[PDB]
Each structure stands twice: as C-alpha cells, then as structure tokens.
Design a protein around this ligand. Sequence first.
Ligand SMILES: *[C@@H]1O[C@H](CO)[C@@H](O[C@@H]2O[C@H](CO)[C@@H](O[C@@H]3O[C@H](CO[C@H]4O[C@H](CO[C@H]5O[C@H](CO)[C@@H](O)[C@H](O)[C@@H]5O)[C@@H](O)[C@H](O[C@H]5O[C@H](CO)[C@@H](O)[C@H](O)[C@@H]5O[C@H]5O[C@H](CO)[C@@H](O)[C@H](O)[C@@H]5O)[C@@H]4O)[C@@H](O)[C@H](O[C@H]4O[C@H](CO)[C@@H](O)[C@H](O)[C@@H]4O)[C@@H]3O)[C@H](O)[C@H]2NC(C)=O)[C@H](O)[C@H]1NC(C)=O
Ligand SMILES: Cc1c(Sc2cccc(C(=O)O)c2)c2ccc(Cl)cc2n1-c1ccccc1
Ligand SMILES: [Ca+2]
Ligand code: NA
Ligand SMILES: [Zn+2]
Ligand SMILES: [Zn+2]
Length: 775
Amino acid sequence: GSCKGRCFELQEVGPPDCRCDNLCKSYSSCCHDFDELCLKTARGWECTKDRCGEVRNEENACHCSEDCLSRGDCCTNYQVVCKGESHWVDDDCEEIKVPECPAGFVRPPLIIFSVDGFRASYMKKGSKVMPNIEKLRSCGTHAPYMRPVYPTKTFPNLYTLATGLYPESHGIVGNSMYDPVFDASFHLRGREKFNHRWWGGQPLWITATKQGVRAGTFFWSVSIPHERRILTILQWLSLPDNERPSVYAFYSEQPDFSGHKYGPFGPEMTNPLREIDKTVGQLMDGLKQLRLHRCVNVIFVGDHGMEDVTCDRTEFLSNYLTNVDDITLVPGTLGRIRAKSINNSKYDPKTIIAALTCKKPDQHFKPYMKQHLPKRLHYANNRRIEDIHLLVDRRWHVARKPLDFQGDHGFDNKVNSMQTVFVGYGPTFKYRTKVPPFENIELYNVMCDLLGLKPAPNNGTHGSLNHLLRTNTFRPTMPDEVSRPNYPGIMYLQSEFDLGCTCKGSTKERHLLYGRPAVLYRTSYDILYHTDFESGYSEIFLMPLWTSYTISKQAEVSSIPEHLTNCVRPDVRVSPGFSQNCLAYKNDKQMSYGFLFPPYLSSSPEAKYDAFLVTNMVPMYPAFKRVWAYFQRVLVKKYASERNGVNVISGPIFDYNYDGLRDTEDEIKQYVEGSSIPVPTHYYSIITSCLDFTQPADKCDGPLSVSSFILPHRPDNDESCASSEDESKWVEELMKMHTARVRDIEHLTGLDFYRKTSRSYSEILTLKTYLHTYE
Ligand SMILES: *[C@@H]1O[C@H](CO)[C@@H](O[C@@H]2O[C@H](CO)[C@@H](O[C@@H]3O[C@H](CO[C@H]4O[C@H](CO[C@H]5O[C@H](CO)[C@@H](O)[C@H](O)[C@@H]5O)[C@@H](O)[C@H](O[C@H]5O[C@H](CO)[C@@H](O)[C@H](O)[C@@H]5O[C@H]5O[C@H](CO)[C@@H](O)[C@H](O)[C@@H]5O)[C@@H]4O)[C@@H](O)[C@H](O[C@H]4O[C@H](CO)[C@@H](O)[C@H](O)[C@@H]4O)[C@@H]3O)[C@H](O)[C@H]2NC(C)=O)[C@H](O)[C@H]1NC(C)=O
Ligand SMILES: Cc1c(Sc2cccc(C(=O)O)c2)c2ccc(Cl)cc2n1-c1ccccc1
Ligand SMILES: [Ca+2]
Ligand code: NA
Ligand SMILES: [Zn+2]
Ligand SMILES: [Zn+2]
C-alpha cells in the first residue's frame, strides 16, 4: 500500500504487494505514494548557505539539517557550503596505501560509473572540461583507451562488461535481434528485453549474490534523475553492515545522445561532459562526507566511442539487389540480412553474397558469411547472428533502400573512433599508473578480484590485468600439458613409402626461443628437428600443429629452384600410415599444397630439402597460395629487417562450427578428395620479437613484442576487391584485417605458448592478449 520508510528498498517484493524499488516505474508497479515519498524534488540537489542548520523538512529532496549526517541523507555538497569543507576535486592527490573504511566494512566497496558513447579522445579535453574525471584518471590507474566488443553498440558492450563474455556467448548480439527458436525480437525499446531468456552468462551482480556478496540493484527507471540515483547509492552505503551492498552501478546515457546529434567533435559536447563531471563530483563529495572516499573503489568505464556519420553517407542495398522486399536488413553501422518471410524457397544466400561483392569502385561495405568474419571479432556462434553480415566502413551507413544524426557507432572494434575509456580509482587500484590498452572482456575478472569473488567461466584471461592492481587475490597458474610428445628417430626406409610423390640442441636454442608449445588436449604427435625449423607433427591430422623458425635481420631470401617446384619428400622418421600422399592432391582438382616452414628462406641449398618434406606439407587452395607465398617470400623477411629478426610459429586451424575453439576429429567437414587429410579453415602465425628492438630476437633480455594473424583459408579472394592486381597491393591489408591475439589461436589450437621465457607469467598473459591493430 505505502512506501514510507521503504523507498528504494533493496529487496524485491512479489504480488500482491506494491513495490518501492528503483525499477518499479518501468514495471508499472509502484505504490501510489512512491512519487510523493521517494521522488521529492523540493529545493534542488544542492545545499545553499541560507539552508545551513535548517530544521528537518521531509518534503526536501536532500537535506542541510544537523541530523542529515546521522541519517545519511544530506545533499552531496552539504559539508562544503555549511562546514567549510573542500570539494573532493579541490584536494591534493593522496596515495591510498590501504583501504580506509569504518569498522564493520568487511571489504572495500565497488562503484561502477558507466558512461554511454564516451570516446577515448574526450579525455584530452582534461580538467578544463572535466575536473573530477581528470583527477580520477591522473590519481588512479588508467589506460589510453579500452577496446569494446563488436558490434560497438550499447547492450552488447554493457553486458560484456557484466559477464566477461563475447556477445556470441552471452547472447546480446545487438541492440536489436531476432531469435529463430523463440520466434521473437529484442529491442532497446519494449517489454521483451525484460524476459530473462535473452540474457546468458553470469553477470557480476548474480556472481556476487550467489557467493554471499550483497549487490546494490543496478538498474534505474529513466524517470528517476541522476542526482536521486547518486543520493540513493550514498544512502545504501550508510546502511548497517548486515544489510548494505558491497557493489553498485551508475549508468549514464550521456554523452551518446549528444554525440549522435552534433557529432563527436561538435562544440555542443562540452556541456554533456560537464554534466557527467558534475554527477561524478556529487558522488565523490558524497563519499567524502560519508568518510568512504578512500575506502571505495571507483571504476569509470565506457562502452564504446563515437564517429562522424551523416545520412548523406549511406549505402543502399537496392543498388546491388533486385529483391529488397524478399529480405529483412538490420541497418546502420553494420548489416545483418535474413529472409523477410519464413516459407520462401526462392531466397538464396549465395546469390545475395555474389551481388554485394565488389560492385562499386568506392564501395563502403563488405559482405560476409559470418564464419568468414575475422576471428578477432568472435561474432558467429549464436543463432541470433544472421548468416549474412555486412562490415560497414567507418563514417558510413548501410540501409536497404533510399526511403528508409551527425554521429554513430557500431563499427569494427579496432576502429579508433570506437575506442572508449577506463579509469580505476581507489585503494585496490594502483596510484598514478598508466597501463596499456586492453579489451573490455577482461574487466569482469578484475571486478571479481576487487570484490574477492570467484569469476564464472568467461573470455577474459585471468591474470592478464594484475598489473592494474596494488594487491592481487589471483595468481595465475600455467595449464598442465596433457599430451607428451614423441621424439621418433629414423625407422622407415625411403622404399617403404608409396605416396605418389616425386623429387638437436642448435635447433631448439635458435628456433624455439620461448620454449615448446604445450598441447592441452589428448592426442599423439611427434617433435621433428631440422636445421631451419622445428615442428610438432600430428599423427591424427597428418600435419604440424605448429612449426617454429627464426629469421635474423641479415638472413637471405632465395627462390624455389625450378627442379624442386613439385618436390615432396617422404619423412623417414614418420610412418607411411601417419603421412600425407601427393596422389590425393592430384585427384583433388581444387586443392593444391603449401609449406609451413618456407622453402624461400632456407639457410642453404642442402637445408632447403627439409622444407620439401611431406611432414611440412599442408593443403592450400591456389587462391590462398598467393596470400601464403607473398607472406613467406616477401613479408617474413620484411618483418625480420624492421624488428631485428623474428621468431615465427605458424600452423593450421580447424573451426568448421565457427565457435572459436579447436575442432575434434568428428567436427571436421572437408578432407582432400578420397583421403583422410583434413582441410584447415584458417592458417595462423605468431610473429614474436624483442621489444627492445636494438637487441635481436634470440638475444632479448627484457620484454617481448608480438604480432599475429588468423588468415581464412578461402577457395577465392573475393574478400579482396583488388585481388586481380599484384600481391603487394592487396594481401598485406588482407592480413591486417585478420590480425589476432595469441590467445585467440590458443583457443583455436588447444596449444599454450611462451612457456619458457625470463618474463613473469602475468606479463606473458598480457602479451597473449595483445592485439596489433595498425591504427
Ligand atoms: C568464452 O567463454 C565461454 C564460457 O567459458 C565459452 O562458452 C562455453 O563453451 C562451452 C563449450 O562449448 C559450453 O559448454 C557446453 O555447454 C552445454 C550446455 O550447458 C550450458 O551451461 C553453461 C554453463 O552453466 C554454468 O555457468 C552459467 C553462467 O555462465 C550459470 O548460469 C550456471 O549456474 C552454471 O554454473 C551455460 O553457459 C550455457 O548457456 C548457453 O545456452 C543458453 C541457452 O539455453 C544461452 O542463453 C547462453 O548464452 C549460452 O549460449 C551460448 O553457448 C552455447 C553453447 O553452450 C551456444 O550454443 C550458443 O550459441 C551461445 O554461444 C548452457 O546453459 C553442454 O551441454 C555441453 O556439453 C557437451 O560437451 C561435453 C564436454 O565438453 C560433453 O560431455 C557432452 O557430450 C556435450 O555434448 C558443453 O559443456 C558452455 O555452455 C559455453 N558457455 C557460455 C557462457 O557461452 C566460450 O567457448 C569462450 N570463447 C572462446 C573463444 O574461448
Ligand atoms: C532486464 C534488463 C535490462 S533492461 C533495462 C535496464 C535498466 C533500465 C531499463 C529501463 O527501461 O529504464 C531497462 C538490462 C539492461 C542492461 C543490462 Cl547489462 C542488463 C539488463 N537486464 C537484466 C537482464 C537479466 C537479469 C538482470 C538484468
Ligand atoms: Ca570449433
Ligand atoms: Na590439384
Ligand atoms: Zn551505448
Ligand atoms: Zn548510441
């Protein structure tokens, strides 16, 4: 019936009782006196000098009476104007060496201050526009930016923060999406989004609650203004020990809305940012007056940035397709295409992909079957992700027809305009510390560490951001190796093979700079030593799982001599029964081959003959060989020249079910015609070097530097619109587009890299999560 003494109560109440919680207005279920009692606006949100030492009047929004501090419901500036205190921002930066909390506090609390559409470059405007945020940033731990997830939209990224999962795993694949099993659609606006069936993983608030850590209700009806929310969090912090929460969240809708209307670089972004900074000031002054400003950990985090995107810069599918009322398009900074009506046999995905590929010369979107999207996006393993996908250029839109804002976002998460912010301030965070950019998928683990919680299974690499924290409650531990390698000697003569083919200390210490990769699944494979390279040959897959070699700054490149162009030699160490054969490659019209260690970089003409071994051979399409041959012949030398030598671990990936994980035997769906030689979906390479570039790769004392990619193993090069031209014009931009982290390849291969270095394991986990973006 009533909400007296009950306003913003942390417990939910079932029917037939009316509600007084922070989300009751969105569920149309508050008591009649909720607005009266709980949403008082009288006399503003700030104490004035006139109001100091007032008698308590219950109609006021916040109070300036003597008893306000006892009750914990003063205005945030009460002590500033009435007790002559300073604003938190006006004070000197002071190191928080331990948490300074009142007695009763079993842990430092966590407040997540979430900002929507906050571009990373907005922080360059600094204390001139945002005093409080610039203090948080400069005094606590901060990054130059933080990479969001794709699509760079609100709900996928916000829920990625809460779960540490990619959108494909947590299920919130866009702001808008259709589910073929539910036969229902999800939008920002509407009642469907409240149905729990859409939301997968385990968000931080559930993780907290399940492990006995009380979480302060995260969600606020849009009717409830920002000042009220800040005041309620501060009031919750005043609650007695047994009742009060240890984790809180504030979501701000700005500066997303201002970013859309006036663009990222408009003069009209300043007041939005001042409004954000003002709100942060009310939190910090409020915490300061509750004596919690050196107790609570504050995270100031964004979900994505903002780009200049005008309606004049729009692509129309009606220029490419003659069937646009047979499809439904999810439009804008990305495209997702589906059959409009279910029960339409004439709809064909292949003809749609054909009609969208490389038509205009200046075409501002690229079509994809989702399995062929760059693996770094991890945007494919969900029934709500349509098979047809359009990656739209930065600064552009894709709509269906001309009859369907100065800023937008949703583009590829590597794009600089999509980068957002991270600051961590408080006892548990480090002091005056810059840290390198990282992915928002990592933060769920950090937030669990801050609250002393065991994270749920997620896509962060736990330990990869220990360098953000003053004290770590998690020390990372190397995974145990499952499959011991065999080291088979010579045990098969050259006359004992019939394949239709015609033609160690020094190895390890130069070609495995960072130790042997550990196989974290059950299989049988062989280590094979050669002069120019080392490999882990799989007996099950008939090819190397990995092939490691090293190329100095002054190493020569050579040709494949013409009498060895078709040369394939049987490996005397490896059985015929566990070897490939060249007869399959003949009988397979579309399938050719290539080599993992390049014959183009062999140290001598004699050593070159190991490169032509059957145990270095992998299946490759003629189209792919153009990419692979350019990489090996030209670019691997180029990287050695620039980076003072490079270690290169290359190999195959099999991911036919596009889940970003290593395929088992039964999950492989294509083989070389009439054989058991499995065809890779991708080929990787992990190109490592010394960060101190003056020291060579094999003489690196300090930290390491890494690049990697996962090239898609395609029958054509339709993805590259300049594939008719010379490889110098197109293949390097293809590679850059499919750049990857070492971690992505470890998911896809079930191998573990960098197991013997001089670097600490947490530092190596940071190396494994690194992504070169070329921006
Ligand atoms: C990124 O990290 C994630 C998490 O670590 C990785 O995803 C995980 O991948 C695993 C391997 O494929 C999956 O395991 C399989 O799960 C099947 C179903 O079981 C479910 O339980 C999951 C876990 O439940 C615990 O945790 C949750 C919190 O997350 C808590 O609520 C619970 O209390 C539990 O403690 C749960 O996550 C799953 O949820 C999925 O389905 C629902 C729909 O009902 C969706 O709402 C979810 O979003 C989620 O969907 C995603 O994942 C499924 C696959 O599970 C995809 O199909 C979807 O497209 C979507 O992406 C489930 O409810 C098991 O039956 C299955 O068993 C097989 O394999 C075993 C051996 O391995 C055999 O013994 C059996 O024979 C059997 O065939 C298997 O264990 C995880 O479910 C999955 N988890 C999540 C959260 O996605 C992901 O790989 C990482 N990415 C990379 C690149 O590394
Ligand atoms: C229901 C929901 C919603 S929908 C919502 C949230 C806050 C305000 C409003 C509003 O209309 O004013 C709407 C939601 C949004 C984001 C996240 Cl991370 C989570 C969100 N969840 C969610 C899902 C499952 C479990 C707990 C919360
Ligand atoms: Ca797989
Ligand atoms: Na062939
Ligand atoms: Zn957003
Ligand atoms: Zn937006």
